[PDB]
Every structure is written in structure tokens, then in C-alpha cells.
Symmetry: D2
Subunit: 114 residues, 4 copies
Amino acid sequence: MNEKSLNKIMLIGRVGCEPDIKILNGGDKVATFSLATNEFWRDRTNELKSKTDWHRIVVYDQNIVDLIDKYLRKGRRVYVQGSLHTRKWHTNDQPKQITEIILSYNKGDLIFLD
Amino acid sequence: MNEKSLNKIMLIGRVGCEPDIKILNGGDKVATFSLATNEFWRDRNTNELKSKTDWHRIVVYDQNIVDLIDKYLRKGRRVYVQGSLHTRKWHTSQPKQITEIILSYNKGDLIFLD
Amino acid sequence: MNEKSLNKIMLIGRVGCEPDIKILNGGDKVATFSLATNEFWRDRNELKSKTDWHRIVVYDQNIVDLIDKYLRKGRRVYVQGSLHTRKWHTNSQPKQITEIILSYNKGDLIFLD
Amino acid sequence: MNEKSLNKIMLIGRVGCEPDIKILNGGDKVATFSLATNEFWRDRNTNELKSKTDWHRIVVYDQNIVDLIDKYLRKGRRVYVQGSLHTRKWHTNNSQPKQITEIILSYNKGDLIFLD
DNA sequence: TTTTTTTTTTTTTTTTTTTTTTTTT
DNA sequence: TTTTTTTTTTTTTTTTTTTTTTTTT
């Protein structure tokens, strides 16, 4: 028991790659894709800077995996909502981190936009 | 690199450290601190209770919120934070990647809780 | 069948009244309370401020259980659900109520002190 | 004079009408439109598939967003909208005050994204 | 959104075995 | 966040009701 917390990330952008669908030992499927969003802003100069961010989306929700399998293609615009989680991993010699947006059973959402 | 996108993360969790307030050239301030959230869930296969605690790096460039943080935010306090999620590359070769929750002017929000 | 949509409201504020718990036919419970949020601004006057009172209706059984046990008038909470409006009829007339609904699986409640 | 609170509502749905743009004293603009969203779910006792459509009144005071709406927003477009949720009383115009509930997009607090 | 690059938090009970290369107006 | 007060939209994925009041740079 830790204290209750909120951890919610909402994104709207474009799919950068063709989603990968893996099957877990047991049948359960997982889907994986990359989503681009952008910002733009003037420097503190008025010169005019831009930034694209690539978010790794990992989907465990079986119904949404299916929808991604059937319909989701590189270049599609989607809304994605989940939780933001970082994991370490080692490779036989410090650990590397990745950060992933996770869509679990009954907690995530995906809406096809375009 | 220009289509309008959405990038919004919202967290409620516990401050892990005394905030660091830095003063930049010309006097704008920037605050950073680490925020812990946790999830708790039942494994898919076994039904065992599981948890995981994530530590989020928060970076505040909003001057009104940096001031509030300077005055009021201590190790151990509970807060709501809202911002945008961005990853930046830094060295040093062997490039390194860090993921940060950024609060800029008029996009982010911080509320003091418990 | 309609097109997929998004309807999500998040609130942090104070509970205005003692939550009401009712039992529906067949044993499901429903909980109901009122939550105050505030806004502050200057009237481009003022020095201006506004309290809004949101009706929260909770159908999620685990959350109703927590509310029954723990939620009291005056408590600060985070509430998240979806915004829905409802007409009803009296007299002789058609009124409208706005409610924030927390369904099975879709809403969340966090006690903040 | 009041504790800090959060009031954030986010919607993706369809514009129901041609937006209405009004110009106020001194030239600030305000735009108004109705946005439809829907839910679909299985009834609890019955398992019967049910649906409900909600029409949200959106009132936009941010001038950059009012501009984009004037230029671009038409009946039938899909949009993302983010604002705060606010109820107010009016009359009536002789008797009995009436509540109306509105999603307000203030300057720098709200957001609007064209979808489809 | 720096010129940076997290070491730590709390307690009104509930989801790999991995490690994104690329997108749009 | 007016001086107002929805009547309509799309198809790519919550009862049987109807809030009276709350808090603190």
C-alpha cells in the first residue's frame, strides 16, 4: 500500500510506424506504436523554434489491440490516453531507461481521428 | 512538424526532494523536482496484488509557479501537476535521453494538496 | 450507433453536503454529493470570483463503497467522470439538470485531505 | 478569498450549428456553438445496448480561438475542445430564474483543435 | 521548455518475456 | 467567462433522480 495517485496522459498526433502486434504466452496480445506530437514557441529573440516528440505507445487492452490490428496504419491521426511509466533494463555491462505510455485493460482510450 | 497536436499530462503524487530553484541569465527562474506516483493492480494470470512507483522529473519555467514553489513547496508534500511531456537528447559519446514533464507559462498548473 | 467521442471532466474542490447513498432495485447502490470549485479574475474592474456547485452522481460500486465509508461534508477531493445533462418534467414544465457521472470503470475519486 | 480548485472538461465531438460570433463593446469577440458527444453502454440488469447523446454549449472568449472559429469552424466538423464548466442564472425575462451550464474557453486556459 | 540530464515521497484498502526511426498541415 | 440563456452533429468503435452547501495568500 502506497497512497493513491493520478497519472494520466492524453495525446493527439500521428502514428509514425506500422503498429507491431505481439502475442504473449497465453494468447493475450500486445500492440506497440510510435506517436508524434509537436510544439512551437518563440525564444526568450522572437526567433521561432519547433519540436517534435515521439511517444512510445504500449497497449495491453485486448479490445484496443484488436482495433489497432484491424485499422491502425502509419500516418493515421489518433487520440491516445493512458498512463506514463518508465522502466529500466540492463545489457550485460548502467541501466537504460525508456518511458512508455501504457494503455492497460479498462484504463486507456484510443480514438481514430483522420 | 506543424499539424496542431495535443500533449497533456496530469499527475497527483508526492514530492521526493527539496525543489531546486535555478536563476538563469537575465533573471528568469526555473524550478525542478521529482514527483512519485504509484499504480496498484491484480496480475493477469495469477491475480496477485502488484504495485509500481514511477518517479517523474518536473521542470517549471512558469514564473508565477516557480515563485509559489520557491516559497511553499517542500519535500514530502502532495501536489497536482499538469504539463506537457517532452524528451531531450544530451551528452556526455553514447547519447543520453531524458524525459521531463514541462510546465511553461499559461500551459501548466500546480495545485498544493495534503 | 454514433461516432466515438470523448467526454471527460476533472474537478478538485470541496464537498458541500453529506453524501446521499441509495439502493436500487436488485442491490446496486448509487451515491450523490455536491462539489464546489472556484475561479478568480479581473474584469477588463475587480477583484472577481465565482463558486460553481457540481452535482456528482456515482454508480461505480467500489467508489460508492469508499464514499459511504469515508466521504464527509467539507472534504477536499479529486473527482473525474463524464458530463451529462438530463431533462425531467413536473406542475407542467421541462427542466434540465447537469450531472458529472462516475460509471463502473470510467471515473475516479481521490481523497485529498 | 477561496482555496485553489481544478475545473477542466475535455470533449471530442461534432459541431451542431454554424457558430455564432458576436462583437462586444470595444471590439472583443465571443463565439458560441453546440457540440454533440455520445456514450454507448450495456444496461446493468438487462445487458441491452444503450446510447445517449449530449449537446454541450461552448462559449469562447479567447480571441485567437474566436478567430480560428470565425475563419474555419463549420456545422458538422469534428473538434477537440477543452475548457472549464460553469453554471449561471438568468431571467426570464417576468419571473423564475433559470440555470444554464456552459463550457467556457477563457484566454490561455482553453484549447480547440480541428479534427475530422 | 536552461546553460539542464530525477535518489527521493506517501498512506480514508485493489498492467511482456519489451527497450518507439518514424508522422502530419 | 457578454450585454448571453444549445434544437443541432457524426458513423475509423448513468436510477426510478432533478446538487443548499464547502475551503483558505
